């Protein structure tokens, strides 16, 4: 119509023709590498140009003019079948997923371009964000059993209702709560259950006792993303990096968007609750990022917080969005641009942590904190605070650039090389 | 679309239940649940109606945004032009004659209304401009104030001296506890200070108290009058919304005048710098006021708190402004957990520019007043306030605040706590 | 409609009064009040006209936002296409030959114009993109800079070394006091640093001074040239607005290039990280620069001030950015009351990452340059700057600033103070 | 205040400094003993800071927090004259005289001062003729 779809289709065909005829990734000459790299670039450039003008119409076809909420995975899958060449097919992703990161063609980058244009739209963006705030099907499935038993054991998370508290314990005892696609699914499911359970008033996130010999008997909050899986090709742009930000982490802030099925929905369409985080040992990378959204943060006297991948790492989620608010532009750049580690007992830890407690008094201090966040006053006040701290436009515009910026970093040679050495 | 008719019907059901059911407090649980469901259905339709019709409703009331109406006039004109949308003057009179525990909560409808009005990018800014205009009372008193340099009001004493508008809050029997009359006096005094060409700088300070526990001691503010709040005499519109959109916003942005002087084309509002001096303490609404001044001095023995963390209403615009001053951790410590901050602790410097011993405070106040005189200050504080708080940011917050605060004003926890004071 | 005719009417009255009345300073009180009233009526109509017509005015000048024009070209094309809206080149030359105290203040009309342009959600972002594009001067000098690794300019020395673009401000006789030429050199150097593929990180430092009170000592910046400001040589457009929308904004957002390289579809601007090293002091415009760098070092004896709290012009975008660094109390202490902040006091850490003894300063500057190399920094500092300062936030501020600063540039208190320096 | 001048500050009842001032006993590598600083500095700054200053030549700036170990008031150049004058009026009475006598007696015993100055007389004499000192001082 303006020719952009036809040009994209053409440029995608050239890519598929080079991938069919050229040797495997590791066997390509420099001229072959430069040729496919140029074809990828031409195709992706046209993905951007097409969506610059057609994003809203593309989204409208997929969601019936914003009348059906689709989560990220369903959205990019429906976009692949309805707009071939715009984003990779399930089959193309499975081929990618079976390769180590160093050998991938980087088809996820197209999903970054796509989600970029979707989140930039003032119509499509807020709708997709609402879609990710709704309860996961898995949580709705497990909710009756959780109301009954007060307990759910998941692969990466243990959830227990006790004294009105949703106790989320991250329990990957062999690898220091290193994050993966399954951890995100469990965290979101647990986060959904806590919010939907009327017997839960406050949530608590803590790391469990580790079993690895260097930490045996010691709790550890988070060692951040699983670098082994990232090297091996198992960290999904959509199902890990974007899902965690638009899903459970955003629900910690804004709650779960429910159906119009209860009183008061006209004033509170989302159910939100206050959250307490307790940091044992350390919070690193993705785990440090989580602390920027809790209502109360406690840490053991020996803990530290870092976003360590300053030279050859991916973007630390929404830390770049939120850290300036906590620490100011100098400290946030010291932390992110230069990898400054902040210790629980140094004065600037009070920018990130409310309470630092000696190991032998921490359990009791955690329990006291849980009783202080009970009321309706807290619910109203933290809603107004989060609204002031982080506007819908601010979050949307950031996650918009993040979708593409992070996709590129996930395929950067410096990242692949570093992660390979872990 | 049928929404007006559905609302009219649902409001009829409410009025019929109120006519037939027994008085508040004599109702059974089935009767209480029935009227609660009727209120909920009507209010849900108030929201839906205004979601699509707010701009047209506002246009009828203001002649397509060509007549500026203040809050009281707006909600009163909306009641007569759109029966059932917001309560009539007579329905409000009945409510106002009841203790808060017995009210049906018709003000909540005004919260719904003002929320939708402020959410409109067309209706919202016009209403905010209307509240920035000088009050009729101030225009009335302006000539005598220019002549005399003095006005004695019930809750405020205003004196022009050395180019300073000295506002002294002088409710000496109740620690300057706030009520509807205090707001009217404060706005009148702020209006006079800004309109008076003999005033260059404003000063807000608490007067000498006469209550036995504080006799001979100045006190800044003990916050909202909790007795009146329990008794039903705190108005959502004429107190909680009026102070935020009126005098407090005028401290930031000045008074919007007519096109009646040179330079109006670059400065349609008259703004001046303000100094606050805190004796004894600043609590609740009085603490909120400090987030808006150009200079804040405090006595060495003063403290600052927003104390109603468990069972209180939202602390005005503190939830909007405190994060900017103290960051997300300290602002939640203060608001979510009621942390009190003392003038001599290091973190008081987040809220206070100067902490001075009682016997050197008067002179330090006078010195501070001479430092804010020029045209440079005027331009710089205009640019600073513009950067600190965008029009959209303030509007969007006050929109949600209008409804969120209305709900809190009728919350059972609030009513119960407030009943127990004094 | 009718606003253009009324404006044309009011501008004619002004021109006819300026033709018949005596020179500025020879005017009586009645004559001064008459021309002041005429200026006021004309400027009021400039605002009212542009309130409704800004976008069409801009569309005529830029071919419906299809041609990028820089500030100087924009206001000059507006002068030729809409006579009386903004001053002509000839009217500006007359103004430029007068001391500030004698000017009619025709720049104020440009402030009105740029305010209305930047306020438009269509015209504003377009003008901002135009100022992010490389200056022609820089494109001209780029091939020799790639070859030689060195450019000597009047106010700036630029050297590529070890992948670092070393900008040394080298006005050794006046403590690097700023003027129109310094801005042109700074933007040219910043452009070169960003366009040069051999540069990975930029460094801004003050050079060794030659004035007797500072001989042999480096000094970062003494702020705007107050002598030139008194004499009428500080241009609203070519200095005060140019520096904010050009080289200072390029430090944040990079240079907008043509679609001429791989990856432009994700990175249409080339940005790089910047280090600032403050010797002696950073004052006024020089202190403003520090709110925009990725790393800031200072010598133990340095201080930072925005000193003109009583009788000064607005300190550029400090009013926009300082609150983010220091909070609303400190930022008002600095700007409203002229509080000076010393490198060794605790709150210096709000503005400065590292404070170092003079004898160890060169070495930590060098260490800092090696820490900002990767692709990780580039991605992270883009996301940080995006979170820190939204396009709307910057645009809306610079819109009001265009007029607010124009008025301050002609304020009697400013002219008087600056005359005494 | 450098060397002998910084030493003097350990003996005053009130010390004011301009915001741009610094205090050092700089000759840590090749200098003579800084008078009675080794006797008095520990009392003001503790054993860690006094060794940082004396053993390692740490320079202390008027605006850093630890300057308050040595200085009572740090004032901007344009307000310093007036701040000096105010300080002079606050030390007038007979009460100050009695109190500063009792303080100095508690702070520095006769035996302590004497025992230090006894060893100092010889230790400093040796340093005054040390080859490192002579060499370093020749290069100034
Ligand atoms: C914490 C440590 C210093 C501890 O070191 P030691 O005390 O020497 O213990 P180790 O033996 O390394 O750890 C014990 C155990 O855990 C394993 N371990 C520890 N951390 C990890 C991670 N992060 N991944 C995988 N495996 C891990 C380690 O391999 C050992 O297992 P075996 O090899 O089977 O023995 C170390 O584990 C470490 O440096 N880990 C890497 C930390 C790191 O760089 N994490 C990633 C940071 N970056 C992100 O999170 C990026 C991110 C995450 C997100 O969620 C979102 C987003 O947008 C971006
Ligand atoms: C400050 C105090 C601790 C002083 O304690 P004491 O030294 O024991 O003094 P008291 O004898 O109680 O005070 C003296 C005197 O003032 C009366 N007093 C003090 N504060 C009040 C208030 N707020 N209301 C009514 N009466 C009051 C107190 O009842 C005594 O009167 P008598 O009965 O005549 O003796 C105490 O008075 C107190 O707790 N006061 C109330 C504090 C409080 O929680 N105030 C409300 C805070 N919440 C808001 O402002 C909420 C708000 C305000 C807004 O403006 C806008 C908005 O959106 C939200
Ligand atoms: C820095 C100083 C304290 C140093 O004082 P001393 O140590 O006593 O040295 P001086 O002998 O005064 O300085 C040596 C030398 O530099 C010259 N010098 C120093 N500062 C200046 C300035 N600002 N202009 C011109 N010449 C200067 C001074 O005139 C001497 O020249 P000669 O007399 O010809 O020898 C002093 O020079 C001073 O007070 N300077 C003025 C500081 C000032 O107000 N600067 C401007 C502040 N305002 C802005 O930056 C405004 C601004 C700038 C922008 O870029 C953007 C914007 O929006 C707003």
Curated annotation (Swiss-Prot), chain C:
InterPro entries given in the database record: ClpP/crotonase-like_dom_sf, DPA-CoA_Dioxygenase, Enoyl-CoA_hydra/iso
Catalysed reaction, written as an equation: (3,5-dihydroxyphenyl)acetyl-CoA + O2 = 2-(3,5-dihydroxyphenyl)-2-oxoacetate + CoA + H(+)
A Pfam family per the record: ECH_1
Residues involved in substrate binding: 172, 178, 211-214, 222-227, 285, 314-316, 405
Activity-regulation annotation: Inhibited by DPA-S-(N-acetylcysteamine).
Enzyme Commission code: 1.13.11.80
Resulting phenotype, residue 418 to T: Slight decrease of affinity for DPA-CoA and catalytic efficiency compared to the wild-type. Slight decrease of affinity for dioxygen
UniProt GO MF annotations: identical protein binding; oxidoreductase activity, acting on single donors with incorporation of molecular oxygen, incorporation of two atoms of oxygen
UniProt keyword terms in alphabetical order: Antibiotic biosynthesis, Oxidoreductase
Superkingdom: Bacteria
Family affiliation: Belongs to the enoyl-CoA hydratase/isomerase family.
Protein purpose: Involved in the biosynthesis of the nonproteinogenic amino acid monomer (S)-3,5-dihydroxyphenylglycine (Dpg) responsible of the production of vancomycin and teicoplanin antibiotics. Catalyzes the unusual conversion 3,5-dihydroxyphenylacetyl-CoA (DPA-CoA) to 3,5-dihydroxyphenylglyoxylate. DpgC performed a net four-electron oxidation of the benzylic carbon of DPA-CoA and the hydrolysis of the thioester bond to generate free CoA. DpgC has the ability to process a diverse range of substituted phenylacetyl-CoA substrates.
Subunit description: Homohexamer; dimer of trimers.
Name under which the protein is recorded: (3,5-dihydroxyphenyl)acetyl-CoA 1,2-dioxygenase
High-level lineage: Bacteria, Bacillati, Actinomycetota, Actinomycetes, Kitasatosporales
């Amino acid at each position: 119509t303006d020719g952009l779809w036809a040009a994209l289709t053409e440029a995608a065909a050239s890519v598929e023709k080079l991938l069919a005829t050229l040797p495997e990734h590791g066997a390509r000459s420099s001229a072959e590498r430069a040729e496919i790299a140029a074809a990828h670039d031409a195709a992706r450039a046209l993905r951007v140009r097409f969506l610059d003008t057609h994003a809203d119409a593309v989204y409208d076809r997929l969601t019936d003019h914003r009348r059906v909420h689709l989560r990220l995975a369903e959205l990019v899958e429906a976009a692949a079948t309805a707009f071939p060449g715009l984003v990779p097919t399930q089959q193309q992703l499975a081929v990618e997923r079976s390769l180590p990161q160093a050998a991938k063609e980087g088809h996820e980058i197209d999903q970054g371009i796509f989600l970029r244009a979707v989140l930039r739209s003032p119509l499509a963006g807020p709708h997709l964000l609402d879609a990710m705030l709704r309860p996961t099907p898995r949580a709705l499935e497990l909710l009756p059993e959780f109301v009954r038993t007060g307990e759910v054991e998941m692969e990466a998370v243990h959830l227990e209702r006790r004294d009105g508290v949703a106790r989320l314990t991250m329990c990957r005892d062999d690898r220091l709560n290193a994050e993966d696609g399954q951890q995100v699914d469990d965290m979101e499911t647990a986060v959904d259950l806590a919010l939907l359970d009327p017997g839960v008033r406050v949530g608590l996130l803590r790391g469990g006792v580790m079993s690895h010999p260097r930490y045996r008997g010691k709790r550890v909050f988070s060692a951040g993303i699983n670098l082994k899986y990232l090297s091996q090709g198992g960290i999904s742009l959509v199902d890990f990096l974007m899902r965690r930000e638009l899903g459970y982490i955003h629900k910690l802030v804004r709650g779960v968007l429910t159906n119009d099925d209860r009183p008061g929905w006209w004033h509170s369409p989302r159910i939100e609750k206050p959250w307490v985080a307790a940091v044992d040992g350390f919070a690193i990378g993705g785990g440090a990022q989580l602390l920027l959204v809790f209502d109360r943060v406690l840490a053991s006297s020996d803990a530290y917080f870092s976003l360590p991948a300053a030279k050859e790492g991916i973007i630390p989620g929404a830390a770049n969005l939120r850290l300036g608010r906590f620490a100011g532009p100098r400290v946030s750049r010291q932390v992110i641009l230069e990898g400054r580690r902040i210790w629980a007992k140094e004065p600037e830890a009070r920018l990130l942590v409310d309470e630092v407690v000696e190991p032998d008094e921490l359990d009791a201090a955690i329990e006291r904190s849980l009783t202080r966040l009970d009321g309706d006053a807290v619910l109203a006040n933290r809603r107004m605070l989060n609204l002031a701290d982080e506007s819908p436009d601010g979050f949307r515009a950031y996650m918009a650039e993040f979708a593409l910026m992070q996709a590129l970093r996930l395929y950067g040679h410096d990242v692949i090389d570093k992660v390979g050495r872990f």
